Amino acid sequence: PMARNKILGKILRKIAAFK
């Protein structure tokens, strides 16, 4: 279920932007 990665991947930009 790529969704798990898709939803998580969505958070990455937030984290990347945050970090």
Q: Which helix (H) or strand (E) holds 7?
A: helix 2-18
Amino acid in position 18? F
Distance CA 18, CA 2 (A): 24
Distance of alpha carbon 3 from its chain centroid, rounded?
11
Tell me how the structure was determined.
Answer: NMR
Distance CA 19, CA 15 (A): 6
Tokens of 13: 């930009």
Backbone angles phi, psi at 6, to 5 degrees: -60, -50
Distance CA 19, CA 9 (A): 15
Place of tokens 């798990």: 4
What are the distances in angstroms from CA 18 to CA 7, 11, 12, 13, 15? 17, 10, 9, 8, 5
Chain breaks in the chain (C to N over 2.5 A) after: none
